[PDB]
Amino acid sequence: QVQLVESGGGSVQPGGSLRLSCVVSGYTSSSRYMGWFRQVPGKGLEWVSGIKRDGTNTYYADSVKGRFTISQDNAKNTVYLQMNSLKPEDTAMYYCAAGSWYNQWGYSMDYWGKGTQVTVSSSGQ
Amino acid sequence: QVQLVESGGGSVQPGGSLRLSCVVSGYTSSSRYMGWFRQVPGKGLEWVSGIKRDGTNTYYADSVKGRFTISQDNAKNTVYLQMNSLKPEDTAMYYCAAGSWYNQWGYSMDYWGKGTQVTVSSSGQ
Amino acid sequence: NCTFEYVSQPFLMDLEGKQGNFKNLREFVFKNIDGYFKIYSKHTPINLVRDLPQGFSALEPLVDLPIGINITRFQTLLALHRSYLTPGDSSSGWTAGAA
Amino acid sequence: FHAIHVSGTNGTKRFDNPVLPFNDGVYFASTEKSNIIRGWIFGTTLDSKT
Amino acid sequence: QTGKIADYNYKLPDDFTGCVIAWNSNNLDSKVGGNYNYLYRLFRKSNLKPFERDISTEIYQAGSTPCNGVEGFNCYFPLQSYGFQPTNGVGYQPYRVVV
């Protein structure tokens, strides 16, 4: 019923910038929460960021304060993640998930997407 | 802490009969007031009937006289609405509410139930 | 985004005489209880410097506004002469009276 | 609190418009042959959030 | 009484003297696409005083994450919108109240 499609992955030199976007299609809105997650090979998922439609309950992981910047485009049903000054640690396999963070009840990441990859290296991917 | 359970609705030809039962659970009582309200789609709630725990200054709307009868059973903590001479406008959503009708103060409709539908039609629901 | 506006006949201007040090002692009592802002006040004609004499005055109620706010802090408003046209030390600033 | 401009040229500019606590209520007295006192403002955080 | 409304939105004094009137408004306040134009306070640091209004919208810190600003975790916008779908059970339909 619902599909998440990512885009914007690749490789960049340390201290660079990137832009990971993804579009949802098949969710009846109300209280969309779209959240970016990273997977470091050999570890579980780590919250990258998240945001609700117009609720602006944004989350940024502690170590990445400032490096990321999340944004939305509700008309296009899309969520954007700007990244600046990629340190070598940031290399990881990135996803965005859709759910619903009702304030009174809690958050559930109902659906997950395909994914893109971010490579911080001195010679590219 | 409380629950109201409705049952007994459905569909019948004009001029038929029915009986809708609403069970109450969770009141210390004293001055229980169980009533039925009617919801016509595209409109608001309307009074149908109401009865106390033995008080018996019952209510019936102006256009609803005669057809409908109200009964109670404190042992089972239940109230019933006998439906007779179903004229077509009686097709609506019936809801049982519970509260307290004090002589001196007034009434409040504290709790509402799940409700059930009634269809006065020539071909059933 | 505001919820209550109100006007009425004024009560501040009841001055007496012309050239006393301090002549009119106006007292107000402000009390915010249960969403209800009660304002009492009374005026006494008294001529003295360094006022608050030793007399007794019963304050009458003026208004009770149904505001419904919290109120923990307050401030007084003073009409201040603007010193950019006055005879006295008029360059850019301000001058006050004696109240 | 004073609102007395006049001085002896040593130090002028004596007035008082401080922000004061309200607590349980206030008694406010005013002595003036003029209209300098004009009213009051009440609140909790007097910026825009209340 | 105690609850979300009786604590964070609208409170009556224990010595109230007056009449509460309430009637269903499903025919003027719920829309097929959803009437999200009615709001209620869901978090607040302390209960209101009687007849005390609060129209603040500062972010409420629900957890232990100091979150001055929009960013932060377990930090919620204090208001919440009623989902008055006309298909809601009467228990969740709108109700106009005059006190």
From Swiss-Prot, chain C:
Impact upon substituting G88V: In strain: Omicron/XBB.1.5, Omicron/EG.5.1
UniProt effect for mutating A58V: In strain: 20A.EU1
Superkingdom classification of source: Viruses
Residues bearing carbohydrate: N1, N70
Ranges where the record places region Disordered: 9-21, 82-98
Function, in words: Attaches the virion to the cell membrane by interacting with host receptor, initiating the infection. The major receptor is host ACE2. When S2/S2' has been cleaved, binding to the receptor triggers direct fusion at the cell membrane. When S2/S2' has not been cleaved, binding to the receptor results in internalization of the virus by endocytosis using host TFRC and GRM2 and leading to fusion of the virion membrane with the host endosomal membrane. Alternatively, may use NRP1/NRP2 and integrin as entry receptors.
Oligomeric form and interacting partners: Binds to host ACE2. RBD also interacts with the N-linked glycan on 'Asn-90' of ACE2. Cleavage of S generates a polybasic C-terminal sequence on S1 that binds to host Neuropilin-1 (NRP1) and Neuropilin-2 (NRP2) receptors. Interacts with host integrin alpha-5/beta-1 (ITGA5:ITGB1) and with ACE2 in complex with integrin alpha-5/beta-1 (ITGA5:ITGB1). May interact via cytoplasmic c-terminus with M protein. May interact (via N-terminus) with host bilirubin and biliverdin, thereby preventing antibody binding to the SARS-CoV-2 spike NTD via an allosteric mechanism.
Protein name: Spike protein S1
Organism of this sequence: Severe acute respiratory syndrome coronavirus 2 (2019-nCoV)
Covered range of the whole protein: 165 to 263 of 1273
Curated annotation (Swiss-Prot), chain E:
Outcome reported for the amino acid change (mutating Q80R): In strain: Omicron/BA.1, Omicron/BA.2, Omicron/BA.2.12.1
Receptor-binding motif: region residues: 24-95
Record annotation: effect of changing L39R: Increased resistance to neutralizing antibodies. Decreases HLA binding to NF9 epitope. Increased binding affinity to human ACE2
Result of altering F73P: In strain: Omicron/XBB.1.5, Omicron/EG.5.1
Disulfide bonds: C67-C75
Functional description taken from the UniProt entry: Attaches the virion to the cell membrane by interacting with host receptor, initiating the infection. The major receptor is host ACE2. When S2/S2' has been cleaved, binding to the receptor triggers direct fusion at the cell membrane. When S2/S2' has not been cleaved, binding to the receptor results in internalization of the virus by endocytosis using host TFRC and GRM2 and leading to fusion of the virion membrane with the host endosomal membrane. Alternatively, may use NRP1/NRP2 and integrin as entry receptors.
Protein name according to UniProt: Spike protein S1
Species annotation: Severe acute respiratory syndrome coronavirus 2
Encoding gene (name): S
